[PDB]
Amino acid sequence: GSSGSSGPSRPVRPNNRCFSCNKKVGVMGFKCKCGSTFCGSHRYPEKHECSFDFKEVGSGPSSG
Ligand SMILES: [Zn+2]
Ligand SMILES: [Zn+2]
DSSP states (O other), X not given: OOOOOOOSSOOSOOXXXXXXXXXXXXXXXXXXXXXXXXXXXXXXXXXXTOOOOOSOSOOOXXXX
């Protein structure tokens, strides 16, 4: 039968929040190159799983 699903998609919520403490960063937060919002204190990549590869060129073949 039908298992049932709530919603794998998020609502029309804003983007004012920290991706580390979830602290609403209003419209003055620190957005990372990856596309995450932080309260300035967690704007660093080391303080948040940042897949983005800042390091200069290195890899070669397709990965991840
Ligand atoms: Zn924060
Ligand atoms: Zn990041």
